[PDB]
Structures are given as C-alpha cells and as structure tokens.
C-alpha cells in the first residue's frame, strides 16, 4: 500500500491529510504524495488560498520496476524529467501566474456571491459602462471566474478562466499574462458582438 519516494517534499498522506498539513502554510506551498490510481501515478497538492487546494496528477513513464519513480513524468500533458523540474517549471510558474492574477486591479477578493454583489453594485453607479472582474472559483480549484455586464440593464454573464503553468486559458487560447487576457476577452466579445449584428439574409 504505502509507497516510498526519496524526495524532500514527499509525504505519506492521503488527499485530506495533505490539505490539513497545508492549511497553516502559505500560498504556493505543496506536498508530493502517492496517488489512489496505482503505482504509476503521484499527486502534487498545493495551496492557492485559505481552504483552497488543487491536486495535480503526475503520470509516471519509464519505470525501472513497479515501485520505482518513473524516469519520465507527465503533468498536464507535458513531459518532465524529475520532481524538481516539475516544481520549478510547472508549479512555480503556476504560483507566479496566480499571484499576477490576484495582484491585478481587475481581480476582486471574496466569494462568488460577494463579487456578484460588487459587480451588480458597480454596474449600478456606472450604468453606461461595460464592467468585468475576475475572482477565485472556490468550487473548482485552479479556476477564476470572469464576470461581466454590458450595461446597468444587461444580465450578468459568468465565464471561466483556467490557470495553467503558461498562462490563463479562456475559451480556446492560453493568454500569457493578465493584461493579454483582458485584451483578448475584450477582443473576443467585440468579435461575438459584431457577428450577432450581422445580416445572414444578405
């Protein structure tokens, strides 16, 4: 059952204990633990925010025997050589990009419900403006909400932005920074809006 892995961030934890362990640590801190999916998988559990953790599957290839750590590791469909490469090139960049998002003036802290309230209020006191903000999706670790209104009387739209190790995924493009995310969001909406106003009976 239990599995040995020779590494300073490897702990003998299930998913829950990894979260309890991390509950006191800071954002970006993590553990590596065994997977419930067999001896060719591991998990990285890392802390995004208070009570907010993500569990990332690591797939092992090139295993010298059933219990050894694969000499090639797959995280999110990208190949890495060892756990340290994962920490530096995958995890650290995911943390970097999380901080870039939460430091953005377009990001609002709080619950989905809190941020819907703010955007609805802010839409009221600025009725001829299109408004959008990002916030944390607490029910899907690793995602942000992208909420917007066209004006005071439009309905409230919610879109979904996935954090990746190389940027922010919205619809079908991975934007490398928040600034480029906002610009692409706007450009995408203008593209949809222009389409919606076309004459298909031309």
């Amino acid at each position: 059952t239990h599995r040995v892995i020779n590494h300073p961030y490897y702990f003998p934890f299930n998913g829950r204990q990894a979260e309890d362990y991390l509950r006191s640590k800071e954002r970006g801190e993590f553990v590596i633990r065994q997977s419930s999916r067999g001896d060719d998988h591991l998990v990285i559990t890392w802390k995004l925010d208070k009570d907010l953790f993500q569990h990332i599957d690591i797939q092992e290839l090139e295993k010298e025997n059933p219990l050894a750590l694969g000499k090639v590791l797959i995280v999110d469909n990208q190949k890495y050589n060892d756990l340290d490469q994962i920490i530096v090139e995958y995890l650290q960049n995911k943390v970097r990009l999380l901080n870039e998002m939460t430091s953005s003036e377009k990001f609002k802290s709080g619950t989905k419900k809190d941020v819907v309230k703010f955007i609805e209020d802010y839409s009221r006191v600025n009725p001829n403006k299109s408004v959008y903000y990002f916030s944390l999706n607490h029910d899907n670790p690793g995602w942000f909400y992208l909420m917007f209104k066209i004006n005071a009387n439009s309905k409230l739209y919610t879109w979904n932005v996935k954090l990746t190790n190389t940027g922010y995924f919205l619809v079908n493009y991975n934007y490398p920074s928040v600034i480029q995310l906002c610009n692409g969001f706007k450009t995408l909406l203008k593209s949809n809006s222009s389409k919606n106003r076309m004459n298909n009976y031309r």
């Binding site: 403006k129 299109s130 066209i150 004006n151 919610t158 879109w159 979904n160 906002c182 909406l189 919606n196």
Partner: peptide, 20 residues
C-alpha cells in the same frame, strides 16, 4: 464550467485595451 453565449446587440463599452 460552460461559457454562456453573448446573445444581445447591446453596444460594448469596455475600458480601453492596455499595452503590455
């Protein structure tokens, strides 16, 4: 986690695009 379709013809009035 679906993205609701933009469905109206309301003119978009977003804040200006930003340089990088």
């Amino acid at each position: 986690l679906v993205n609701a379709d933009l469905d109206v013809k309301d003119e978009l009035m977003f804040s200006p695009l930003v340089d990088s």
